[PDB]
Write a protein that binds this ligand. Structure first.
Ligand code: EST
Ligand code: EST
Lengths: 232, 230
């Protein structure tokens, strides 16, 4: 009942994290400062991602190992999915934050992010061509959280993933297009999940290179967030 | 235009032949990495012929063909491994004369992680009871969906054709309309898991190159340089 399509979307809509306000530094972007304004923004969003995930129906009913498994495997993917939704209507730019809008070429000051920036902009453009809705994005983001763990309590997670899947089918069904067009959109939407995951792995492979070059302190930003923040 | 009933039949005849490695002496870190990279090299030769037999692939520009192959070749090798191993838990059937149990990875540093990813994704396909026709569509979809960025419009048509074929395959099973969307969604979500395995299994091959366990990293490029045209 709480997993009902119309209801689950409303729950997902009310679980959306608040906008994080980070601004540009006064000095021009250097490799150290840009890699710092991005990991600072990521740290703040990861605080809200825990509250968002805990607010998806059934997530708190999962085991503690499964919750950590899902978050550890999806946090970078969820950060990128939210970035592409904020940049969906601004071609050539990445809307990390309202007061932090980065043009593409601005990534020329840090080694190797332009490859990652082009991946994000390309996937964002494909979501623009598909005319991604707001409720498709809410389902897709929740699906990323529930599906990104590989597991290389199990019955409850499978039920939630199917529930969010029913919600995405229900949102597409509201478009009124043909049954064949409804399957095509569902397939075009989910085939992009591979491109988001690819960006998740590549943009994260780049973050490991920055820790080895002593540009950033640590690599696992979720682990860093949890270690530094305190429980109320 | 090919019907979905006719496209699936074309993918069937495009299936590569089986390859043997026959080897070796117990397994070392270098000997196992030698056998797996040597197996991939032999398979990559047949992957070129397989891709060119997918309807419309030869009509794509030469740039597009190389772009798709460079992006998906590890995924295609891994998807083919998963299909061969779908009915044998705990085992990876790389080639006929090379069936590895899960624990046999311990000899190569970091390979157990990749093996468990391949086995777990293989288990999801087994629990889904992946059909032959579904496998043929999915593997073709991996080639045509791997790229990120007149020939571009033709590629979107080919991916639509293979996707329609998959939807047709699911529809002909006679399951509920809600079950048809559920099955299509579960299949395509596993594409992300194939990509994660491809990215991590390739991150691992790069570490084996810096460790000087294997000579080359881009096995597709090494194949095209060494093999000659007829
Ligand atoms: C992970 C990186 C820093 C954090 C960046 C970020 C930071 C916040 C956010 O909401 C999204 C993204 C996506 C791109 C990420 C970058 C890609 C490479 C870089 O290391
Ligand atoms: C890419 C690796 C070598 C080649 C292996 C292979 C080789 C042939 C094949 O058909 C499939 C696979 C998947 C696993 C691959 C391995 C995973 C890690 C290792 O580097």
């Amino acid at each position: 009942m709480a997993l009902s399509p119309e209801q689950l979307v409303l729950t997902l809509l009310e679980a959306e994290p608040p906008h994080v306000l980070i601004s540009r530094p006064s000095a021009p972007f250097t490799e150290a400062s840009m890699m710092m304004s991005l990991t600072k923004l990521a740290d703040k969003e990861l605080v809200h991602m825990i509250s968002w995930a805990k607010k998806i129906p059934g997530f708190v009913e999962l085991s503690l190992f499964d919750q950590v498994r899902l978050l550890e495997s999806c946090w970078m993917e969820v950060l990128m999915m939210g970035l592409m939704w904020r940049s969906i209507d601004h071609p050539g730019k990445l809307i990390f934050a309202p007061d932090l809008v980065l043009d593409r070429d601005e990534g020329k000051c840090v080694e190797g992010i332009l490859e990652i920036f082009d991946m994000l902009l390309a996937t964002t453009s494909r979501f623009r061509e598909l005319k991604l809705q707001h409720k498709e994005y809410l389902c897709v983001k929740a699906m990323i959280l529930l599906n990104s763990s590989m597991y290389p309590s199990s019955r409850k997670l499978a039920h939630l993933l199917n529930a969010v899947t029913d919600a995405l089918v229900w949102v597409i069904a509201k478009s009124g297009i043909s049954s064949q067009q409804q399957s095509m959109r569902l397939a075009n939407l989910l085939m992009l999940l591979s491109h988001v995951r690819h960006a998740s792995n590549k943009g994260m492979e780049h973050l490991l290179n920055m820790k080895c070059k002593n540009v950033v302190p640590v690599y696992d930003l979720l682990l860093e967030m949890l270690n530094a923040h305190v429980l109320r």
